[PDB]
Write an enzyme that holds these catalytic residues in place. Sequence first.
Site, PDB file in Angstrom:
ATOM      1  N   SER A 110      39.585  79.176  99.165  1.00 30.76           N
ATOM      2  CA  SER A 110      40.375  79.890  98.175  1.00 30.76           C
ATOM      3  C   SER A 110      40.014  79.399  96.784  1.00 30.76           C
ATOM      4  CB  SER A 110      41.870  79.688  98.454  1.00 30.76           C
ATOM      5  OG  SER A 110      42.664  80.449  97.572  1.00 30.76           O
ATOM      6  N   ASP A 314      40.588  90.170 102.192  1.00 31.18           N
ATOM      7  CA  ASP A 314      41.006  89.377 103.357  1.00 31.18           C
ATOM      8  C   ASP A 314      42.519  89.187 103.395  1.00 31.18           C
ATOM      9  OD1 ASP A 314      41.359  87.709 101.239  1.00 31.18           O
ATOM     10  OD2 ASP A 314      40.239  86.023 101.956  1.00 31.18           O
ATOM     11  N   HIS A 355      42.490  85.610 104.876  1.00 34.27           N
ATOM     12  CA  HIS A 355      42.712  84.348 104.177  1.00 34.27           C
ATOM     13  C   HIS A 355      43.103  83.176 105.054  1.00 34.27           C
ATOM     14  CE1 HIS A 355      42.117  83.437 100.003  1.00 34.27           C
ATOM     15  NE2 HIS A 355      43.243  82.714  99.891  1.00 34.27           N
TER      16      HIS A 355
END
Length: 391
Positions: A110, A314, A355
């Site tokens: 991330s 995602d 994610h």
Amino acid sequence: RANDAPIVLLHGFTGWGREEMFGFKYWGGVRGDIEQWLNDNGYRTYTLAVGPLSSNWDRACEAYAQLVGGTVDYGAAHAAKYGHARFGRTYPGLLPELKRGGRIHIIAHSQGGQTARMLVSLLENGSQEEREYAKAHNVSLSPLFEGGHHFVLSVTTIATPHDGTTLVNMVDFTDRFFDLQKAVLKAAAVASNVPYTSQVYDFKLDQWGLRRQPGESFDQYFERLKRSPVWTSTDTARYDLSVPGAEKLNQWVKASPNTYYLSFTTERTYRGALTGNYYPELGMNAFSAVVCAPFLGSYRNATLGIDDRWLENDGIVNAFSMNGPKRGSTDRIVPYDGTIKKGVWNDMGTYNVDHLEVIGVDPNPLFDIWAFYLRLAEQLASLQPHHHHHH
Ligand SMILES: [Ca+2]
Ligand SMILES: [Zn+2]
């Protein structure tokens, strides 16, 4: 192994230390413990915990002190510009070897990918504005801002918004983003409506003088934070996460020529034939699927430069943002061909994982998370410190 540089793990706008969240691991989540997995397989691995909501800069400064040891120094110019404390926490230093020629691989998920890039940039080049400020005002200067550090052999990014995420353009992004924090808290079986006396989830907001108070639940804490400088300032994750903020960052945070870069792109969507939009796949984490994906898969903005290429995502980040910095960037991106080049982004491809599934915070029995991180580890350990030229 061509190298013996340990691996260092680095989270994004959510993330916590190994001892936080009652031991529920950001790196592993409901699946297990990724660091421990890697160690057991013979790859030395450590874990950084830095402010989730803090700017990439603050996180870079925190990462550095945490690695080599010392009191976090945010820089005098930076602190004066944004009105927070120059000094932060003190750390023992995970790897004092860094102060002696040693190197490390950073694996970042991330927004940790932005942080990692900036840490490489600062280590290598320091900060001109920090050096001039110290010369003009006679304040001390952190060695982080002088330049010349070579700690990082490689940086790997996983679902990183290198060009930002259109998530931040949701009209109710503020509530929804903290609902996202409550979602991850929930995943770890921690309630957001309970004033736990134990720390549980430290946002490490020491520079801002912000902390959860006795008798304050996470719901009530997040309401204060929403109105605080960690949410309203430009010196924030919120700003760095936006498309324009990411671009700002890219304009000075460049790939080091002495460093390998690997990017993994993630997606969990399908395209609708009639609308051109993308939708969350079956299995995507509940929160992303209802709240975030529909917006990400359908939001366009002509003036901002957001077109069709941005719609695949995602659940949190647009896939098109992840292969490497492009907007405001001179960085080069070369598709992985079997030879990991140095000084360029090696796009390792696109994986069908949302994610939170890629770090195990959301289940996906179809995703072999252990094989993923092991193959990665194998790959980084094969990186040649030095590469000569040949036919
Ligand atoms: Ca899932
Ligand atoms: Zn700051």
